[PDB]
Each structure stands twice: as C-alpha cells, then as structure tokens.
Amino acid sequence: FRLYWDDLKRKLSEKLDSTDFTSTIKLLNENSYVPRE
Amino acid sequence: DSISYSNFSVAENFQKMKDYYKEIEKLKIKILQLIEAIKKYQQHVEEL
C-alpha cells in the first residue's frame, strides 16, 4: 500500500496531537543541565 | 521548580551587593584619613 500527500499530512497531524513538548522543555531546564557553556 | 529558576538572578544581585559594600569600606578608611587631614590643617592654621 502507498501513501500520498493528503493522507500523509493527516498522519503527521495525528502524530502531533499526541505528543507533549512542555515536559521536554522543562527537562532541558533541569538542575543537571542549566548552565551549559 | 520556580525557586530553582530564580537562582541566576539572585546570585548575581547578591554578588553585586558584596562588591558595593567593599567599596563602602574603602570610602570609610578614606573618610577617616580625611578627618585626620582636617585636624592637622586645623592645628596648622592655629600655628600661622
């Protein structure tokens, strides 16, 4: 089976509705990594 | 997590306060030497 465009932007939107960016942005501001020159 | 986030601003402000209070100390020794210079001038004008 093959995937064309209008199926594929739909698949991307179904992936983006699940994820959670806020926890990762808080993770990159943790006390382990917070100064990094 | 919020108390941890305030750290970088708080540390720099406190360091600045330490710097300024060092300069208050320097002006305190200098101002005592100034009042001593005033009194030496005072006895000299009495000696003119």
Short mmCIF file of all heavy atoms in Angstrom, two decimals, chain A residues 12-21:
data_model
loop_
_atom_site.label_atom_id
_atom_site.label_comp_id
_atom_site.label_asym_id
_atom_site.label_seq_id
_atom_site.Cartn_x
_atom_site.Cartn_y
_atom_site.Cartn_z
N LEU A 12 0.71 13.07 9.94
CA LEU A 12 1.54 13.96 10.75
C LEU A 12 0.70 14.67 11.81
O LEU A 12 1.13 14.79 12.96
CB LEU A 12 2.25 14.97 9.87
CG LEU A 12 3.23 15.89 10.59
CD1 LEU A 12 4.35 15.06 11.17
CD2 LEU A 12 3.79 16.94 9.67
N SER A 13 -0.51 15.12 11.45
CA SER A 13 -1.35 15.79 12.43
C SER A 13 -1.80 14.84 13.53
O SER A 13 -1.90 15.23 14.70
CB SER A 13 -2.55 16.42 11.74
OG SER A 13 -3.39 17.05 12.69
N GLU A 14 -2.04 13.57 13.18
CA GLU A 14 -2.38 12.57 14.19
C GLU A 14 -1.19 12.29 15.10
O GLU A 14 -1.38 11.92 16.27
CB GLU A 14 -2.86 11.28 13.54
CG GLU A 14 -4.20 11.40 12.86
CD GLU A 14 -4.62 10.11 12.18
OE1 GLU A 14 -3.80 9.16 12.15
OE2 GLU A 14 -5.76 10.03 11.69
N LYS A 15 0.03 12.45 14.60
CA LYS A 15 1.19 12.30 15.48
C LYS A 15 1.36 13.50 16.40
O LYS A 15 1.74 13.35 17.56
CB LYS A 15 2.45 12.06 14.67
CG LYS A 15 2.53 10.71 14.00
CD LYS A 15 2.74 9.62 15.02
CE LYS A 15 3.07 8.30 14.38
NZ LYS A 15 1.89 7.71 13.70
N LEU A 16 1.12 14.71 15.89
CA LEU A 16 1.37 15.91 16.70
C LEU A 16 0.34 16.10 17.79
O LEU A 16 0.61 16.76 18.80
CB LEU A 16 1.42 17.16 15.85
CG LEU A 16 2.78 17.65 15.38
CD1 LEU A 16 3.27 16.85 14.24
CD2 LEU A 16 2.66 19.05 14.96
N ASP A 17 -0.87 15.56 17.61
CA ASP A 17 -1.89 15.75 18.64
C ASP A 17 -1.59 14.95 19.90
O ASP A 17 -2.12 15.25 20.97
CB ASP A 17 -3.27 15.40 18.08
CG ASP A 17 -3.77 16.41 17.08
OD1 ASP A 17 -3.35 17.58 17.18
OD2 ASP A 17 -4.58 16.05 16.20
N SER A 18 -0.71 13.95 19.79
CA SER A 18 -0.42 13.09 20.93
C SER A 18 0.67 13.68 21.82
O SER A 18 0.56 13.62 23.05
CB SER A 18 0.00 11.71 20.44
OG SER A 18 0.40 10.89 21.52
N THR A 19 1.72 14.25 21.23
CA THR A 19 2.96 14.50 21.96
C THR A 19 2.83 15.67 22.92
O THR A 19 1.82 16.38 22.93
CB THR A 19 4.10 14.78 20.99
OG1 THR A 19 3.80 15.95 20.23
CG2 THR A 19 4.30 13.61 20.05
N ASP A 20 3.86 15.86 23.73
CA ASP A 20 3.86 16.84 24.81
C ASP A 20 5.22 17.52 24.84
O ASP A 20 6.20 16.93 25.29
CB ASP A 20 3.56 16.15 26.14
CG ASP A 20 3.10 17.12 27.20
OD1 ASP A 20 2.96 18.32 26.89
OD2 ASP A 20 2.87 16.67 28.34
N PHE A 21 5.27 18.77 24.38
CA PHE A 21 6.56 19.45 24.24
C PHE A 21 6.99 20.07 25.55
O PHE A 21 8.20 20.25 25.80
CB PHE A 21 6.47 20.53 23.16
CG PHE A 21 6.24 20.00 21.76
CD1 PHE A 21 5.78 20.83 20.77
CD2 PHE A 21 6.47 18.67 21.45
CE1 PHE A 21 5.57 20.36 19.50
CE2 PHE A 21 6.25 18.20 20.17
CZ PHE A 21 5.80 19.05 19.20
#
